[PDB]
């Protein structure tokens, strides 16, 4: 997995690849690793997939309830403190490594959270097995005061570094852009550079090929 977060002049962008693995097998060639915590707070997650979806949805739920109670738009520092205290409580057993970014009344934010409960703030961050390939890129092309267009490319390139060079990453690139005055724009499959070539033959079988012993109708309705 490769996930990145890049801060730009009036916003933040996060991106991730879409390959899900179980050992050396690609269980899902197009999973989604960009989770919505609230409309304008999204989180990229790496590690144990069930854990990143679970911790994200739980905090997102509680964040939704906190917002309705306080009549205020959710803040990234809230999702951050809630996520981290939860992860710390479980001593690393909930394998969620996240890049939480978002815009709220106080501005644009980008933080990272490791499974054990520590957080970091930065202008560009990456996590996942592809973390090193992505960071090599971020360390080569990041510069301060990037434009929205430059940040999307930078974050997109970092993910590509991982897709190509990490066996733990692959398929497509998902991006979510959170700009200070606008609605968050989730760009699912922003880049699709790994389409399978057409197969050399068609494996459609002639009907009757399979030997059937018994056939019967299933009753659905009560």
């Amino acid at each position: 997995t490769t996930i990145v977060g890049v801060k730009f002049n009036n916003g933040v962008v996060i991106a991730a690849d879409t390959r899900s693995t179980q050992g050396p097998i690609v269980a899902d060639k197009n999973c989604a690793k960009l989770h919505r915590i609230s409309p304008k707070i999204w989180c990229a997650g790496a590690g144990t997939a069930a854990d990143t979806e679970a911790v994200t949805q739980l905090i997102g739920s509680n964040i939704e309830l906190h917002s309705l109670y306080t009549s205020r738009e959710p803040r990234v520092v809230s999702a951050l403190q809630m996520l981290k205290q939860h992860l710390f409580k479980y001593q690393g057993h909930i394998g969620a490594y996240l890049i939480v970014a978002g815009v709220d009344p106080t501005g644009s934010h980008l933080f990272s959270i490791h499974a054990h409960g520590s957080t970091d703030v930065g202008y560009y961050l990456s996590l996942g097995s592809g973390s090193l390939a992505a960071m090599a890129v971020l360390e080569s092309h990041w510069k301060q005061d990037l434009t929205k267009e430059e940040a999307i490319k930078l974050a997109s390139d970092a993910i590509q570094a991982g897709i190509w060079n990490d066996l733990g990453s692959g398929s497509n690139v998902d991006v979510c852009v959170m700009e200070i005055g606008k609605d968050a724009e989730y760009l699912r499959n922003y880049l699709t550079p790994n389409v399978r070539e057409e197969k050399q033959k068609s494996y459609k079988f002639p009907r009757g090929t399979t030997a059937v012993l018994k056939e019967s109708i299933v009753n659905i309705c009560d």
């Binding site: 899900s20 179980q22 097998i25 269980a27 899902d28 197009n30 999973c31 144990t48 997939a49 069930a50 854990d51 979806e53 679970a54 057993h93 909930i94 197969k199 068609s202 494996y203 459609k204 079988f205 002639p206 009907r207 090929t209 399979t210 030997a211 059937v212 012993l213 018994k214 056939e215 019967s216 109708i217 299933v218 659905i220």
Partner: protein, 204 residues
């Protein structure tokens, strides 16, 4: 010692043109000993089918738990659960036991009664959802099925053709797995009708 390798078994689900299919083998064994050749792993709650591979006591327990939960759902909601919804129920039920999980690999296949869109999903033992548009494989011959499916599968097949495809994916995957086989069953599911066919296969 690997709870997911004690009893054996596989399940595969595929989507087609206004249809889905879910198939499974019929073996239940104890390590090398074949024990039953009538162990179906596909269950259905209304028009939603769920196949489950893994440790047999959990497979049986989960079917019973989902029947329980879908029965209550139907009573409170006054309508049968949909595939998208059930999928979320399975996931939440599996993650509830995150640190003492059921050793299974569920697979959901069905067609939404309102929109008619074919649906299939797979899960790992702790609930992570894999909503694929093509196929889902599970079991002790999952690698084999992935191999079969990746080659044999092509989008939008008609019920009559999907049958052959899923059947062959299943059959040949099982013949390369020591813990699977001893019979197979395929369900071809359409908006209105569901057909169940038992396949003839080697019994070794």
């Amino acid at each position: 010692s690997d709870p997911s390798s004690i009893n054996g078994g596989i399940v595969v689900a595929m989507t087609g043109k206004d249809c889905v299919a879910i198939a499974c083998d019929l073996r239940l064994g104890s390590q090398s000993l074949g024990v039953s050749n009538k162990f179906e792993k596909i269950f259905h709650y209304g028009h939603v089918f769920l196949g489950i591979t893994g440790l047999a006591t959990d497979v049986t327990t989960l079917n019973e738990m989902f029947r329980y939960k879908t029965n209550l759902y139907k009573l409170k909601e006054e309508r049968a659960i949909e595939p998208e919804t059930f999928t979320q129920l399975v996931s939440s039920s599996l993650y509830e036991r995150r640190f003492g999980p059921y050793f299974v690999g569920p697979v959901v296949a069905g067609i939404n009664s309102k929109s008619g869109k074919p649906f299939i999903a797979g899960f790992d033992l702790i609930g992570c959802i894999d909503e694929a548009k093509d196929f889902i494989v599970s079991g002790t011959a999952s690698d084999q099925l992935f191999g079969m499916c990746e080659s044999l599968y092509e989008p939008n097949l008609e019920p009559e053709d999907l049958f052959e495809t899923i059947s062959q994916a299943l059959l040949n995957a099982a013949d390369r797995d020591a813990l699977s086989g001893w019979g197979a069953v395929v369900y071809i599911i359409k908006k209105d009708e569901v057909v169940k066919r038992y396949l003839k296969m080697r019994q070794d």
